[model samples]
Target: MKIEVKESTMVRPAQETPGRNLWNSNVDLVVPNFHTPSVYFYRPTGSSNFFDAKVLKDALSRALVPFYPMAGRLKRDEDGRIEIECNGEGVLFVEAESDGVVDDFGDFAPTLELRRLIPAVDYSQGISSYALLVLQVTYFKCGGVSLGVGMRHHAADGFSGLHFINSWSDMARGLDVTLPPFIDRTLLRARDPPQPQFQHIEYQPPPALKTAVSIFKLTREQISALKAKSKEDGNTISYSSYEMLAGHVWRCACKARGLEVDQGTKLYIATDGRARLRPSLPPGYFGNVIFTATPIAIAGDLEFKPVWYAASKIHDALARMDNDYLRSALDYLELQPDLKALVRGAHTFKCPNLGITSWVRLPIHDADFGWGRPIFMGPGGIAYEGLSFILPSPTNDGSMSVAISLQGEHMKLFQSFLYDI
Candidate 1:
């Protein structure tokens, strides 16, 4: 198969893309682990026939032709920071059973394998935001089949992901195409000379202990109520619910582990700083929008603490981080004199690490092909931490879901607490 590069854009100097983001710069601190393959799951609607396997495959390949610029895009530079360039074609399409769609995106498996076959298939969720970007086929056996699709974070952020998917879906269906303003490169301004305000400490250590993980599936009704109640007392529900929920899980798990929540506990909330930045950026621009927010408390402080308290603290802490602390955070990582030590130092906490990351508003639905919409959507790769909490929006059917990698002992605790009578 021949793949062509349709567009060419260069990596803007760090002096560009805004030195205002510590994450955009810290891309250098850690080795480029850019080989991320995002896998998703899908099922067709109303037992409809979507495609023949061959026709589906051909359509997927053709659909992906325009998105090949994202493969192996990150290369290390002289200063140890990484720069991105077009890598090549990076789209794959395969079919797996309906069961496998949800299971694989959650588990830490050796390789991505398919489950049952309603004419199962697998594919590289499409790299870079090629409009008309989803995968699906309508055939006789199953009602219809959507795909387990995903893309690497390096290619684009959620906004970009959504835009791409929307564009792809629109085109596949022969809708009007907007000449994507193409600001991924054009919008970036040259970076001004640098100065420091804060620093980042990056410590990627090997796992010394084994842990069991759990996937908590929240019913749409449950999440709806939580969102409703969160705003009952003049408190509104935002993505912050994920942060609060993370805190709740951290406290509950530690409590179940025969540990105290307030005993020097530190939880890190991954805050997307894009919309909050000064001179707010355009929505379509991609790349990481994440920042870290740590919520700390002592063992004695949370020993008998109610879950609501932890959630509230998480909510408030995230608010503060979003409102004011991010600028200082960017300053520290980019402006600090001793960048390495500062980044390393920032990673340490007297408490076990409970990480919280959110993927809400990610454009999973926008990834449309000629067939139709996807049946399922979530992320790949379980974080290697005692407790890494992931927050994804509902699948097409509206199921509230979270993928968590936690200590095995905590998994036991989760089972004990969440078991249905």
Candidate 2:
């Protein structure tokens, strides 16, 4: 794979005026972190038709110009504070080998390469103290590609990233597309005097968090047993395989760590708030429009508490979202401001109490750049593993494939626990 560089930006500090924007707050945390360039790897699952490098690049240039705002340089004022407007050039793409371990990314380009991928992959998940958006593309000899994109977390949440990718894909397909209006300013703007209602929270930083391992596949026989055992109890919604699996995961991780499950093991799961808002927000609108639901099981509680019970609890919390919850969360986030930082710092398994987040609504499997569709699709990194899972619906199957990243030791325990499950 020959990577001929045609563009690169000279990043600068942000400026100040019209007060700092929400995008600005994140740029501080995103820009300086150049160490971990966000990576998005990809490979073709079926027969592949590679695009011409020069032609694809030309098409990409035309499609990406409107998004220049994302790549803009951050300008700073004499006061050295912050500015609202940026240069709007925050995206990049590269092609490389699609096989082998991406542990160190020390290898050179492998054969099969992607001139370009339609519907850009989201790189927001990779933002850290050292790098902003670092994306990696690995094209494999098997005619497959695994894409990893690293974008500043605070820049725009999953939804925003999806909107961007979908828009890009539309352009690539030459289909008439309407760009989603980015109301990031309005969505994250502060109320005058800042309501000061909620307390900002951050997670207990890394090491405490674990990496996501592969999802444990449930066989037809095993799933039947789980459902049968869970169905014995009456008056509650039948527990889903996910619910049982999730519950067992939480319990197993706690027991392995020698912690009391009842000691309040918290599991955070991503609940999309799209339909919960009144006057339904546009489907294209993106950002972190999600609220975390934590279901805790004390060590003692699990001794008597059936896993199905915990599953019910998770289901209820997810179902509880409505207009009120959405409004309250958004309003509270805007009002308190500081609470955001504190929440990110402590929400994972590091708590002895763990959290599981799922993006069941994201159309990740919907990625089709004029090609028919992929045979298999899922994210490939072990982001902080506190039961973090990307819930992408599997191709041709309603069964959801939970792409999880958990601590290695804990993952082993999880697998062992599945036998008895």
Candidate 3:
């Protein structure tokens, strides 16, 4: 698993940027944090010219001209809020060679070995010293390549990150940028004299963890069955596939963890507010506009009740996220600027906390840098014990993959429960 680093340098945008830019509240929530790590695996054809590291680097520089924030450094304002110091500092780009082959990572499950393929950053240096984005291109002995990408969460959300990745690939292949990203984040501004009325218990810092990790797959047919089963309770309201699957996992995970039946437990589901708000955000507006749907249930009830019971809870909770809810959430963060509680998707696992972060519809596979599309694209590692990530299969087949980190024994039980369902 040795990797030889051939080059490491900062890649500035093709043009210069002006003064500092303030990130709105949506960006503030994830500041001081790295963008979630992801790796895209590609099998090269007879395309040596397209896979050249030099060519990729040149394309990245050109792409940065429009996505200048990625080349900027991170800093904090006088008010202690994080802001992007858009001084064209340049992003970190590394070219490396791996002794291993792409097949070494069989399924590309979230593992430490896979993480090594991505570039590393020292958060201790603080944000201002480093670029908001970092990238690594590892050449495998078998001629395949892995593109490991890291972006500061403060700079972009999943949607925005993918936007940048796709745009870069378009440049690499000499394609015109079809849609330019909307850079204005002021649309997420907080209310004057912020009045936050919602109780934001879910955002609390996550509890200490002793975690074990595992991966689970659900075929399209299995998902359809799960959706059909949720309707058995005679609640006519249609449930999205995400809601049904999340509910199903939450129930099984609780039972597998062997928590006391009567204890209160929570399932945190991420709900995007981009399309739900009034006037809706533009299709190309790239920033964080996300909220969590926190639904609680007694552990015993979740396990013993009909599976649709949990599904209904999720369905209802998400239905409540309207424009008013989004506004109140923004105001709440403004009024209570507690860094611990304000962190995006923050939570403690002291209680039975299960957080499901979905990347189902994101365009992770569309990042074709001329060679070909990725065979697999997913998180490199699970962040914590209680947190799980759900992503759609790269094949575009009707299947889903769930990456989970939990205790060994609990994972076995969780797998059994998942299969039983």
Candidate 4:
């Protein structure tokens, strides 16, 4: 699992940026310590066109022209808010080599070992010294390559990060990309005398511990059955595959945790507001436009209620999102003095908390850097309890995979409940 670092250097933009880039209220609220990690694995191309680190470096350099902020550093203003100093300082790019083969990772499930493939950032060096984007290109003994990317959450969210990767791949393929990023954060600016209207409890970090992670996949048939069963009570309401599966998992997870029937529990989902806002923000308006939606119920109902009951709550909560809600969320965080305290751990759910992040439809699989698409791509590790991630299958067979982490004892029980239906 040792990933030997061969070279480390700054990969600056092909050009230079004039000055500092202002982070919107959403970006300012992000905790400085968190990073979103992803790795793409590729097999060797038998043709003369093998993987070239130069092509990726060149493409990243060109991609930085539009994503120039990524090559900059983070700084705190006099007002104590975070902003990106777009100085063209460059992103941290590392070249590494591994003695393992791609097949050494069975089923591509996340593990602590997988983390070695990604580059590490020294946040202790202060925000100004930290790179907004850090990358590692690792070559395996079997001619397999892994492109590990780590994006600071404060600089971008899942959508924004993916957008940059896709654009980088486009440049690598010599394709023309003219969709400049929309950098105006005024739309999400906090209101004067900021008054937060909603309960911001979801942002609070859960108590941190021993967490075991596992992955469960469902075929199209299994998914359809769950959907049908969710509506078996003769209710005419229809539920999407995501709703049904998430609801089912939440209920099972609660039961596995052995919470009291009367204890209040929550099912949390992070939804994107790009399309939900009124006069919807442009499709490319990047940065964190995501907010968490929590559906609360006593453990009794979550455990015994029909699966659709939970799914209905999910649907209702999602339906409530609009421009007003997003603005309120931004303003709520604006009122907080310490944004870092609001940073929640991935899972780390101690009591009656469980969170699910669905990236099933993201364009992550579309990141083809001229060596065909990645054979697999996902988080390097899920290090906390009660966190679940739903992702699309690389096979493109209309199936979905769920990666989850929970306490070892709870995981055993959760597995039984998961398939008991």
1-421: candidate 2 lDDT, tens digit per residue: 3333333332222232122333543212222122211223333435445432333344344444544344433344455433323343344555445334432232111111222221133435532112234344455545544454555544455666666555555665776557644444354343454443333121224223234355554455665576665765564568776677666666666666666433655666655655676766665654455555655556556545666776776777666666665554555554433443544432445636666655555666554455444444444333355544535444444454444445667667666765675
Better of 2 and 3 by TM-score: 3
- Candidate 3 colliding pairs, count: 8
User: lDDT for each of the candidates?
Assistant: 0.44, 0.48, 0.79, 0.79
Per-residue lDDT of 340-394 in model 1, one digit per residue for the tens? 4433221342125455555665655555555555544544444343434354553
**How many clashes (backbone atoms < 3 Å, residues ≥3 apart in a chain or on different chains) does model 1 have?**
50
Candidate 3 C-alpha lDDT tens digits along 248-364? 889888988888856778777777788898778887786677677788888888988877888888878887888898888877777664654455433454337788888887887
Cα-based TM-score, every candidate: 0.65, 0.70, 0.94, 0.94
RMSD to true structure for each model, in Å? 8.7, 7.2, 2.3, 2.3
Ranking under lDDT, best-scoring first?
A: 4, 3, 2, 1
Name the weakest run of 10 consecutive residues (lDDT summed) in model 1: 13-22
Off by over 4 Å in 2: 1-51, 65-68, 73-86, 97-134, 182-184, 188-212, 219-230, 239-245, 334-340, 343-347, 383-385, 419-421
Model 3 scores worst on lDDT over the 10 consecutive residues at 201-210
| Alpha carbon deviation, residue 61, candidate 4 (Å) | 0.4
Encode model 4's per-residue lDDT on 1-421: one tens digit a residue. 6669988879998986667667656644654366678888988987465667788889889998888877878788787767777788898889999878887877676665677778876767787887888889898888888988888877778888999999999999999875778765567777887887777655655322116777777788888889997657688899998889999898888889888877877767788878777677776776777787877777788778789988888888787766787777888887777777666655435657888889887987988988889888888776667678888988869888878888888988887888776
